[model samples]
Target: SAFRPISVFREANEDESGFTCCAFSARERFLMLGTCTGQLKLYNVFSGQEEASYNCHNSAITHLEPSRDGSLLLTSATWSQPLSALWGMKSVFDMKHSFTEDHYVEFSKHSQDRVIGTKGDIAHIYDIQTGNKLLTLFNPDLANNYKRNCATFNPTDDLVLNDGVLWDVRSAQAIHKFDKFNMNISGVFHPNGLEVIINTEIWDLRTFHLLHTVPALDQCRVVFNHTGTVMYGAMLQADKSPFGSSFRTFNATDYKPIATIDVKRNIFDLCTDTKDCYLAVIENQGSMDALNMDTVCRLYEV
Candidate 1:
C-alpha cells in the first residue's frame, strides 16, 4: 500500500502541457515522451537529462513505440498530415519514413524492419528501410469512416486485424479467421511475437489456435512488462467510462492472475522500461475526450 517511485522524471512544462504517449527504448538506456504539441523528447534514464528532441508531427502524438531492437521509432497522431512516421536510429534520429494513418502500428519484433499500419479502410505492410508498400488488405466493413483500430504483425510475419482475420504476409491471403471474437479495442503481441492477446482471447501465432481466454469482463488494454515476466490487463469499470485505478496483472509464463495494484486514479496509459524496474501510468481523472489536458503521470517502483 505504500509503494513509491525510486526516481522521478518530469519536464518543466509537464503540468501545463499534455503528454499523449511515452515509451522506453528496448535497450533501457533512454526514455521518450510525445506531447500534444507535436514534440518528441528523449531523456537519459539514469542521469535524468534531456538528451535530444525532435519535432515528429504536426499534432498530438497518439502513439510512440520503439522497435524491439531499438533501431527504429514509430510515431502516430490523431488529426494531422503525415499521421504516422517511422524514424531510423542509425547513428542518431533520422526521419526517413513517414505515412498517413490514424491508428496503432506494429513493427515486427523479430526483423525490426517491417511494420504493419492501418488507416480507415485498409491495412498494409511496408519495408522500414525503403518505405515500400509490400502488401495491402482491405476490409469492406471499414467503409464509411468506421476507423480501423487494430493492426499488428505476429512473430510469423503475419498481419492480424481487429476484424478477426489473419492475413499471411507472404501468401497475401487470409489463412485464419476468428469470427467469434470481434470488437477488440486493443491488442498486443507478446514480446516473442509467437502469441497474441486480443481483447479476452490469447492465440498461438504458429497455428492460430486459441491458447487461453482471459476471464476479465472489461479488459481494454493488454501489455507485457519490460522484462516480459508479467502481463497486464486494464479493465474498465462497469459504467464504461475511463478505466478504474486498479488493473489486473498476470504471470507471463502461465497467464495466471497474480495481483492487482490500486493506482488511485483513472489510468489512460501504462508504460515501463526494458528491465521492468519501474511502471508509469498516465492518470486522467476524467473522460479522455474532454481535453482537460491536466493529466499527470505517476511512476512506481516494481
Candidate 2:
C-alpha cells in the first residue's frame, strides 16, 4: 500500500521558492520546512500548526535534517548568507545557533552525538556534544560540483562516505572507495547498515558487491524507511523533470518500484519520520509568482 495525504502545511504569500525543502523530526509529531525566502518552520505533523519558526537562512533552504533525538538540526540554503547552519530545537526566540559555513549537512543517525557534512571544499566529522572538530575528510573535487552536496554519514555513525570514499569513523581510515558516480553525488546506508545506496546503485556491505540499480531519475535523492523496507525517491525543484514531481516508492528487497504518489507540484525534497508511518513531502515552485498554497509540505500516512 502507498501513503495517503493527511495534512497540507503552507505559508502565506511566499516567494517563488515557497516551501523548498523539508525534513521530519525523530518522531511523527513534528515536521520541518524551509523556504526560498530563508525561513525554516516546524509544525505539528497531524494538526498543521506552526510550533516554531527560524529565520535561519538567507536564500532557499537546500537541505534540512534533525538528529535521532530531534534535538539538533542541520540546515542549508542557497548561496544564502549565513550559508548552512545548525540550530538547537527550542522556541523561536530561544533556539541556539550551533554551526554554520555549511555545504550539505546531516546529523549522525544512530548515536546522534556526531555530525558529518562539509565546510569549505572538504567534509568533516564533528562532535555534537561539545561542538569540537574531530576529523577532516578531504573529499576529492568533482567534475561539476555545485551546491549538489558532498558528504554524509550512514544511518549508523560507523562510516563516513564522501567523494567516492568510505572511511571508518572510529579508525579514521579508508575502508572502501567508490569508483564512479557524482558531481551531483548523494548517498546513504540502509537501516540495516549492511548495504549502502549511492545515487541509483545499491551495494551490499556484507559481501562488498554491487547489487542492483533502482529505476530512478538522474540525481533523484532517495531515502529509505526506518526499517529499510521501502525506498522513496524525489527530485528537487531545481532539477525539474517532465514526468512531474511525484514520490516514487520501491520495495527495498527487490529494488523494484512499488508505487508512485503524485504531489501535484514539484517535490523539492522528501523524508520520513523515525517510524515507517509518516512521510513529509516537501513541495515547492521555481517559476515566478508562487501564489496561494501552491507550495506546501504535505504530510502523508504510510
Candidate 3:
C-alpha cells in the first residue's frame, strides 16, 4: 500500500521563506531544519514544537545533517559559498569545528567518529573530536577546472565515494571506478554497506561489479529501510498540481516494485528517519524552485 502523510510542518515566520535542507535524528526524536534565512531550527517530531533555533550560517543552508549519535550537527551554506560547519549538540548552540573549500561532508557510519569532506578534487578524512586531519584522498585524473560534486563515506566507513570512483580509505587509492554512470543527482549506500546505488545502477561493494540497475524514471534520491528490507526512490517532476512527483518503493533484495506513491505537490526532497518509521517529503507551496518560499514538510508513517 502507498504511504500517506500523517502530519505537516510549516514555520511560524511571516516572511516568504522556507526550509532549504532538513534531516531526522538517528532515533527520530528530533527533526532539524535548515531554513532559507541561514538559520538552523530543531523541532520535536512528535509534539510539533520548536525546540531551538540557531543562526549557523550566512546564507541559505544547503545541507543539514544530525550525527548518527545525535551529538553533532553538520551544515553547509549556500552552494555558491559552500562553507561547512560542525556544531556541538549540547545546550547553547556551539560550533565546535568547521571545514573550508568543502561542499559535501558526512560522518563515518562505523564507530570511527570521523568526518569525510570534499573540496575541489580532494577528499579528506578528519577526526571530529580532535579537529585533526586523518587522511587525504585525491582524484588522480582530475582536471584543473573540475571539482567533485559529491563525496560520502559508505555505511561501513571503510570505503569512500568521490564523484563516481570508490576509494579505499586505508590505501587512499581508487579501488574501482564505475565508468558508465554519472551520480550527479544522488547516491546512497545499502544498510549492509555491501551495495551502493549510484543514481539508477546498483553496484556490488565487494566485486565492484554491476548487480542491477533500477528501472526508475527521473529518480533523484535513493534510500534503504531500517532493516535493509526495502529501498525507496523518489521520482521528481517539473510540473505542478495533478501531474506531480512520486516515490517508488522496491524490494531491496531483488529491486522489484513494491509500490508507487503519487504525491500531489512538487517535491523538493525526500528522506526517512533512521528507524524508517516515517518518510518525510518536502513540498514547495510556491514554486518548484528551491529558492521559493512557503514550503511544507509532510511526514508519512510507513
Candidate 4:
C-alpha cells in the first residue's frame, strides 16, 4: 500500500515556446516538437541538444506523423483547418528536409472554406513518396460526413481508389467509400484493401481488418506504435473533472485489447521510442511520461 508509482522519464523542461503537439521526427533519430506558434524544434532526445528550429507555420500543430518508412514528416496544424506539410528527410540524424508548403493546398482567398485544406483531415498512405497531394479530395457522392481525424495506408497495393475523397497513395488516385452507412474510423483495412472490418462495438483497431470498433467507454487518445503493427489507446471516465488514466494495448490484426495499465493523469499524446522498448505519454501542456513496454503489461505484479 506504500509503493510509489514507477517514475517515467521525460525532459526536465522543454525549450520550445508553445503547446508541443507531437515530438517525433521522420527518421526517429532526432526528436521534432510541433508547437502552437507554427514552429517546430528538432532535438536529440539522447543528448537533449537543440539541433534546428524552423517557423514552417503559424497555428496549433495538431498532428505530426512520419511516413511508414519514416522518410517524411507529415504535419496537420489547426482544428477544422489544416495544412499538411511534407518534409523530405535529407538524413536520418539531421532535421534537414526538402521542405515546401507552397501550392500543396491550392486555395484562393475567396474559396478557402470550400477547399479541404481548411479542415484537419487525415488519410491513409503507404510511404512518404506517395503521400504527395494529388488534388483536393471531397465529393458529394461519398466524402466522409465529417473531416477525418486521422488517415492511414491500407495493407497492400493494387487496390483501386474508392470515393475520390481520400487518396490512395499507391495509385495516387482519390479513394472511394465502401458501405457508407457502416464505415467509420473504427474500421480496419485488409492487406489488399479487398475487405474491412468495423468493430465499433469492440475497440478502435484490431489486426488490420480482423476486428473493428473498440470496447469500454471514454476511449479517446489512440495511436499506432512505431512499426504500425501495435496499437495503443487511452481511456478515462469520471463523474467530475480530472478522471484517471487507462491505457490498453491491442492486437493490430485482431483488434483485441491484450494488455492494460491504470494511471492518475489524462493521456493526451503517446510517443513511441523506436530504438528502445519504451513508449511515452504526453500528459498535457507540460508533462511527459515514458514507460517500458515490458513493465507496461504488469502495472503492479510480481
lDDT, candidate 3, 1-302, per-residue tens? 56867987787665554766678876668888777778887779999877888888877777777777777888887554548888887666788888876777878887749888877667788898887888887766742222224678887777887666778887778877666454343356777778877777888888878888766733356666668888777763432221246778888887788988877566656667877678877766775664645766787888
Model 2 clash pairs are none
- Report the Cα lDDT for candidate 1: 0.69
Which candidate do you rate higher for lDDT, 1 or 4?
Answer: 1
The CA lDDT of each predicted structure is 0.69, 0.69, 0.72, 0.43
Residue 227 C-alpha lDDT in model 3: 81
Q: What stretches of model 3 exceed 4 Å from their correct place?
A: 15-17, 80-82, 142-148, 183-186, 217-219, 235-244, 287-292
Q: Please tell me which predicted candidate would have the highest lDDT against the true structure.
A: 3
Candidate 1 per-residue lDDT over residues 133-158, each given as its tens digit: 88777656432222224667765565
- For candidate 3, the per-residue lDDT at 260 reads 84
Q: What is the per-residue lDDT of model 4 for residues 1-302, given as tens digits with 9 covering 90 to 100?
A: 11223323232254423434454564556666665556666766556566776665667565565554555455655532335565555553333322232212211112111112223333322223443344433445565543222333344433322221335543456544544433333233333234443323332122323223345423244556555566665553332111245667666565566777655545445566564345554444233443311111111211
For candidate 2, the per-residue lDDT at 162 reads 71
Cα distance off (Å), candidate 1, residue 127: 0.8
Worst 10 residues of 1 by lDDT: 140-149
TM-scores, each model vs. reference: 0.83, 0.83, 0.86, 0.58
Winner on lDDT between 1 and 3 is 3
lDDT (10s digit) by residue, model 2, range 1-302 = 56788877777444423687777777667788887678887777667788777778777787887766656677777686566667777543333444567567777777677777676446777776666778887635431232454677876678877765677878877777765664565566777777777776688877768887764645667778878788777654453221246767778777776887776665667777777878777665444343443567777888
lDDT (Cα) of model 4? 0.43
- Supply candidate 1's per-residue lDDT for 59: 85
Report the Cα lDDT for residue 170, model 1.
Answer: 71
